Swiss-Prot record, chains A, B:
Functional description taken from the UniProt entry: Subunit of the fusion protein that is processed upon entry into the host cell. Mediates fusion of the virion and cellular membranes by functioning as a class I viral fusion protein. Contains a viral fusion peptide that is unmasked after S2 cleavage. This cleavage can occur at the cell membrane by host TMPRSS2 or during endocytosis by host CSTL. In either case, this triggers an extensive and irreversible conformational change that leads to fusion of the viral envelope with the cellular cytoplasmic membrane, releasing viral genomic RNA into the host cell cytoplasm.
Protein name as it appears in the record: Spike protein S2'
Source organism of the structure: Severe acute respiratory syndrome coronavirus 2
Gene expressing this chain: S
Source domain of life: Viruses
Amino acid sequence: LSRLDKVEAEVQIDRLITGRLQSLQTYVTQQLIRAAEIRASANLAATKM
Amino acid sequence: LSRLDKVEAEVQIDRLITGRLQSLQTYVTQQLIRAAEIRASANLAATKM
């Protein structure tokens, strides 16, 4: 943003947005899968209690 | 499609395709994770029966 004007900057920014958004989607998806593992383990622990 | 010719339209259409396809992948992935939660609950319910 400090080095390029709006018409050229928005092209560069859209590349970062795309890759950063994909990085959050990858993280949140794996956290959802880990949450299921923890949920199953918590259900087992509640049954053991 | 009504406003741009093929060479320019396909560039704009590919942006929609990319984002809409990413929306379906996000939806189907979360449905697969929810299906596992429902599956675990159905297995529990079958055991309670």
